[PDB]
Structure formats: structure tokens, C-alpha cells
């Protein structure tokens, strides 16, 4: 769901910055959706950012869809040994009511 | 969704223990659903546990539903000042195919 919507990826900056990006993005008249994405330890922070937004605008911003997934990352030793690890990810789509009211 | 299903709450034990609980629980003939729950920093770990399970049984265990929420926790100073903070949570319902095959 929410294919094409702009994306806010949770990085090193303070959760406060991503909340601002989410809100600023959603305040645009022609944009009613924004997806928040994160991997690994940042997943908790993605949820925090979304919950701050949800609780501030509990009446017009809904969590439309959530998906979790994981990626297999691998490296090869020079002698041909494969070493792998999985990294989890989360994607949360937030949708604002029609426009406002 | 998945009302009534048994619950695996992600705590201090190693993610490996919760994966075992999830699988052991799902291996029961009459139980096709299990909800994984976590709050705060443990949310990343809930996702990891679920992804380990999902990738090991990618063909018969599906993520049926996911919800995130947050709780307002508060304490009162003896002089009447309220101090609050929000704690995020996640609930993931895993469902196994009919029985097996």
C-alpha cells in the first residue's frame, strides 16, 4: 500500500527531526501519504516518531499499513567462505484525512 | 485481529528463547496463531524474533496483522506536578497455514 508516497528514512538525526519531516511532508495540500522506514535498532525509533505524530494529530492521521521484512547481507572471505547476517526492517504508511477539518 | 491467541512478550531473555516459544506454541495442533508483543527498545527485538521465524518457515507462517500504539505513563511529584512520557509498543500476529504440508 501507499506505493509512490514520499519516504522518511530513520537515520542518525534526532527523532524530532523525522517527526518534523513527516509533518511538514503531510502538511502539503497534494500529499496525503508518507512512509516511514527503518532497519535494525532504528525500528524502535521509527515507531516513536510515528507515535509522536499519531498522538499529536490523533484525529486526522491514521496508520494505514505496516510491513516488516528482513534482508540477508553477506560478505565473502578471500578464501571463498560466505558469512551472512539478517537485518530487519519496518515500513509504516501514515495517511492524513482527505485534507483537514 | 487474532483475539484470544496466546502471547509471547519480548523481555530480557535472548531473542533465541522467544523464537523457541513462538515455534513451540505454533507447533501445537490446535493453535494456529500467536501474537508477539513488545514495548520501547524491545520492539526491534520483537521484529527480529518474528523475522527469524518467518524466514525459517517462509512457506507456512504468515504475518497476519501488525499494530503499533503508545502508552502515556505518568508520575506525580509530592507537590502536585505531573510528569509524563510515552512508551511505544508493537503487536505482531503470526498465523500458521491450516496445519502443515
Curated annotation (Swiss-Prot), chains A, B:
Write out the residues that bind DNA. 9, 12, 39, 41-42, 45, 85
Superkingdom assignment: Archaea
One matching Pfam family is Alba
**Keywords annotated in UniProt:** Chromosome, Cytoplasm, DNA condensation, DNA-binding
Mostly located where? cytoplasm
Keyword Electron transport attached? no
Q: Please describe, based on the UniProt annotation, the reported consequence of changing residue 12 to A.
A: Decreases DNA-binding
Question: What family is this?
Answer: Belongs to the histone-like Alba family.
Q: What does this protein do?
A: Binds double-stranded DNA tightly but without sequence specificity. Involved in DNA compaction.
Q: Which NCBIfam families match?
A: DNA-binding protein Alba, PRK04015.1
The name on file for this protein is: DNA/RNA-binding protein Alba 2
- Per the UniProt entry, what species is this protein from, by scientific name? Aeropyrum pernix (strain ATCC 700893 / DSM 11879 / JCM 9820 / NBRC 100138 / K1)
